[PDB]
Design an enzyme around this catalytic site. Sequence first.
Site, PDB file in Angstrom:
ATOM      1  CB  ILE A  59      13.844  25.090 -19.165  1.00 36.02           C
ATOM      2  CB  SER A  60      15.264  27.687 -22.936  1.00 37.42           C
ATOM      3  CB  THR A  61      11.018  31.250 -24.452  1.00 35.39           C
ATOM      4  N   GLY A  62      12.517  29.637 -27.215  1.00 33.64           N
ATOM      5  CA  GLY A  62      13.166  29.883 -28.482  1.00 33.64           C
ATOM      6  C   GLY A  62      12.235  30.539 -29.494  1.00 33.64           C
TER       7      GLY A  62
ATOM      8  N   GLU B  82      11.570  29.224 -32.537  1.00 29.68           N
ATOM      9  CA  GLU B  82      10.809  28.200 -33.240  1.00 29.68           C
ATOM     10  C   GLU B  82      10.059  27.254 -32.312  1.00 29.68           C
TER      11      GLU B  82
ATOM     12  CB  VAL C 126       7.890  26.989 -25.948  1.00 24.84           C
TER      13      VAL C 126
ATOM     14  N   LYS D  54       9.678  19.892 -25.697  1.00 22.52           N
ATOM     15  CA  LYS D  54       9.834  20.950 -26.688  1.00 22.52           C
ATOM     16  C   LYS D  54       8.600  20.944 -27.581  1.00 22.52           C
TER      17      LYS D  54
ATOM     18  N   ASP E  25      24.080  23.708 -36.907  1.00 21.07           N
ATOM     19  CA  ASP E  25      23.704  24.788 -36.005  1.00 21.07           C
ATOM     20  C   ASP E  25      24.587  24.750 -34.765  1.00 21.07           C
TER      21      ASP E  25
END
Lengths: 122, 65, 359
Positions: C148-151, C153, C155, C181, C297
């Site tokens: 869905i989203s790649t960060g 720190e 995945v 995650k 954050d």
Amino acid sequence: GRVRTKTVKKAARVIIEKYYTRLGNDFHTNKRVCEEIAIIPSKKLRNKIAGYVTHLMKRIQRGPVRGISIKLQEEERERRDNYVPEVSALDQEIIEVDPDTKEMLKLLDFGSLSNLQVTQPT
Amino acid sequence: PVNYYVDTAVRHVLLRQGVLGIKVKIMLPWDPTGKIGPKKPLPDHVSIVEPKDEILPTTPISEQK
Amino acid sequence: GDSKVSISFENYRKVHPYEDSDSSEDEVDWQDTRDDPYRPAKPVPTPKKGFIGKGKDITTKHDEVVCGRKNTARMENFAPEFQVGDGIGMDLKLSNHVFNALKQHAYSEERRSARLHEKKEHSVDPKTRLLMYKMVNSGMLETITGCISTGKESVVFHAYGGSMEDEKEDSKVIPTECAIKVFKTTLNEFKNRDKYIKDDFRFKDRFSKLNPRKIIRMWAEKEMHNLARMQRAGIPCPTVVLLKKHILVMSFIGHDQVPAPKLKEVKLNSEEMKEAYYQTLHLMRQLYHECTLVHADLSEYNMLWHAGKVWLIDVSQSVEPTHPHGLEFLFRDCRNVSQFFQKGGVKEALSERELFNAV
RNA sequence: CAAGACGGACCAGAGCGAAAGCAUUUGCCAAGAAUGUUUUCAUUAAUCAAGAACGAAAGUCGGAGGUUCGAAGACGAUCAGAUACCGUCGUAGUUCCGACCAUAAACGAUGCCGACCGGCGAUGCGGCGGCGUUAUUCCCAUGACCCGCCGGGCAGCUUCCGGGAAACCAAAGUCUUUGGGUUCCGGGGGGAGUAUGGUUGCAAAGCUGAAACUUAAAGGAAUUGACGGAAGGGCACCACCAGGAGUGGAGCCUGCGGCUUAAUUUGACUCAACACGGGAAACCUCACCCGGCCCGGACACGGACAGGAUUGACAGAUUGAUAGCUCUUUCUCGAUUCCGUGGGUGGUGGUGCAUGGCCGUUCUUAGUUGGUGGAGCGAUUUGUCUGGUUAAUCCCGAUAACGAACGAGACUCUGGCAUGCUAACUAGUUACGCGACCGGUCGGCGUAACUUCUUAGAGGGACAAGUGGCGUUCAGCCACCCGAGAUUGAGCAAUAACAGGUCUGUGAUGCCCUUAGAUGUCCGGGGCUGCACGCGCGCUACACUGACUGGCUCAGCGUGUCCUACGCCGGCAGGCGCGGGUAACCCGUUGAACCCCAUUCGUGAUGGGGAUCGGGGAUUGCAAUUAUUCCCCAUGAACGAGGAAUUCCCAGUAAGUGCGGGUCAUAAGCUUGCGUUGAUUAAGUCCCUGCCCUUUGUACACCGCGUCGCU
RNA sequence: AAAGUUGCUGCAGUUAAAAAGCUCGUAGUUGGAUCU
């Protein structure tokens, strides 16, 4: 910063050690006579040798040099070395002596000396 | 000096196993060119000629010549 | 002999008219001729009777001089790391008592260099993929759908969870859509995270000498604990189902494998923006008061809009208010929230200082 | 007041005891060493199986009493897992009497008796001799002192006696130059001081004490330092402070990924990949894909072939192709050959982990290594430092070291200076004359000089040179005068290294793979540039310190047989003619941009800024379709200084600004250089990071993975 | 045999394997000079 290396210092040392007479405390007089003796490459080496020669003969006026050894030492240190006083400091008019030393002298058959004065260990 | 004293020469030799490289760096000497060596010395060597041993003064002598 | 600062004896040289006299100019050339010692002997076949000649000049088989020259030539075929010298130019009669010792040393030296070289040669991740496959085969997750989203720190992967047939009364309900995650353990850029890890009293004694994999596991455990604390206070956050090493499985925010849009990417109306700002302020107040933690954050990307509600994610960097930098982080988060709300046109959005005082 | 305890401070390398051990006053009892002895016996001695007395602490039986401390045991804290850890209570014990036990790192890890071999002076005891001092000058002996000497002690210091593997020892010496006497006891490491037997003891346990088997080492000294996270010191705008420009926030270009594709060749993946592979690709390039063409298969053998081995070919069919590529058409060509067997060639085809070379990196550092001499058996060590000094193991000076060599430095190129030198019609000035205009201007014309301007060669010049402070007053460091400069910028770059990149740069290359429907050659077309998305450089901007227009006015590298002047047609892009230049001769006095003056616009996503999109025009090329470029209208979008994070920089520097070269038939948003305008801050540190460097130690020890099942 | 790793010739026992905790003491072993 600005520190002279091995070659220039050793060359200036041997230039002081032999040919000490013809050079002098004036700078440029050294420069040319370096060219007149040592067949040297660039003028940066020459003008760096002739700098330490003047800086070393300025240092000579403060006394001896720990690195060089020629037996000339200006003309004053030779005069200072052979100084002789008018009266010997060893021919003392009277000498204070321990009785043990006088006993040694008497045992040595040297008991008739006149400049001796026996003092007591008070 | 590394431009006119050392004589770099790389060559390739072909053996059974493969290729070997050969480097031969021969530094030329001084004693200017009587068919040997370059003229100018190494730009660091300074050689100092010893003085002629001169006559020390003893008596002022006037000799007419 | 070789000094740079040198002396010249030119004045003591008396007479030299013809300096290039033909006495020192001898042409020494012996390489290409047959006079060089550095040339093979063109070996004779081995005699069968064991000697050459007869009488008194019988040259025998080993013949210590000959055998010494032969052993020198056999030294010439050693390992490249060996150093010999000039053993052919000078007549070297080397014996087997010495040559065998040197040969043994050459073998040992080459062998130990080979051992050092072999030790040098003997020096989502595949382990994470194996863990995901084991979790999928265990019935916890039905199928890994996609990413869905790649960060930077971690995945985040969206997946469909499985239906556990074990009728346990204490079994947690597995959601239909789950987000896994997985923290990146092959990236060395995670070095400033100790600014938010060493200051926590719950894991300082463990993170004082932890490995990077252990640091990632502790960060995942802290994120799971923060998610549990947020869920206990009623704050909108993903509920963690199970955590395995550096992989944490939580409830997915969205429907039909579509992640919930972020607050920055959502084109909300003025009333919707005001409601979102009020919900964010209420969530921040609940986190500061009930959860006793500061998110540190909080931004537009960290908040997702779903069903008219604001959900908070990425609580891995969250710290308690008792930390030495908790107040400054809370003030920075309040300032970021105030800037985001003022950018959206919310006239009722308070300033950074007012939001910090209210939270 | 009572109860038991223990005798600190005095307490020392002191004293005594056979050892274990032994400090409160006084008394009693026997003991004891040393000393002194012209005392008595006269060999009565040394070491000792058996045997015997003593034997710390702990322990064991009986009794007494129990302050304190305390194994066990009971609490409380501490946690992913504590059960070690810490603080509170508390039994046996610790205390005395009478009996067992008999073991300790019970140590000097060094049996006892005797002799010899260096020196020195402290201390205890006894004795001897005294210059002399004190008991308020003591009336004479006498204790406390001082100077020695002797014997026997506990110790010390020093030594190249000597010994030893050495650490070290004056005994661990007097040992292959091997014998003074005597007791015990060891024979590679474990198994193991275990089993069994005997004996002592109530017991715990003590004494004696194997074997089977297993292992090639275990162990003792000394040397270097991997390594320290152990510590300080030290250096760096590829680190920081103060700052400047930014990047990251937009648009676009380019590169790398992913996604598609027939193919979207290819390598490179922290710094040490990602405008890199001179890699800005219409074909070629081109390795890749879709299809064709050719042998450009040398040479050897065998077969075919002159009554032809063959080559090339007009017309039609096919074909993108005057592709005999194939068929029909039958014309040419005189062995130049063909078919298989062999093995040669051609590969941008595989292995940079098989290689050379080149290059990059550790490192643009600060080290590297001999010779002779000293020490040690030797590994090894000094030289290669206590300290100071610097950009530098650069230097000074100590000094068993003295001298060296490589690196750094020196060097070479470039820049600032020369009114001194050299000499210019392919450079320039001045003068005169000729003009032209209103004594001033002329890059507008020619001969006299001349070298200041311009060229480019020699020589000179700058060295911590001079002065004042600092200085271990050495080495050198801060400040100042004079000077053009008190000093720029690069090239080259040591020892030891890296599985760093390159077979894809080579007719460099080893093993190879293929070699005639070829991974060889050539041709046609496509692709390398394809796009949901991500990551790095770079370029434009966000407007007023700005934009538009007009006018003004100054360079430097440095190309060019294509560079171009000039004239004519066109609004531009362009086109035509005539020239020069193979080059300080011509383009060119290189009328460059930013900047300087004036006009208009005045905070408005505005005329800022031009991403996207239509139409037309011209050039280069066989071929612009995938807009190659360049030009003219029109369309005018995000963007209103940018989160986390991050890069680079100290003085003609950063930034701003344009020109040249490389690539180039066509071309720079890249890069290599070049001028023009021209700053802020600091001149200091280890706060981040990185790299050092010295000292000390120094060649994964132990306590906390299992249950069941049958043959 | 090398084995001076069985040592009378001829080994070791501070730290590498090793001197009994200490003393007495019998058997054993060795015993001052001195008589042509």
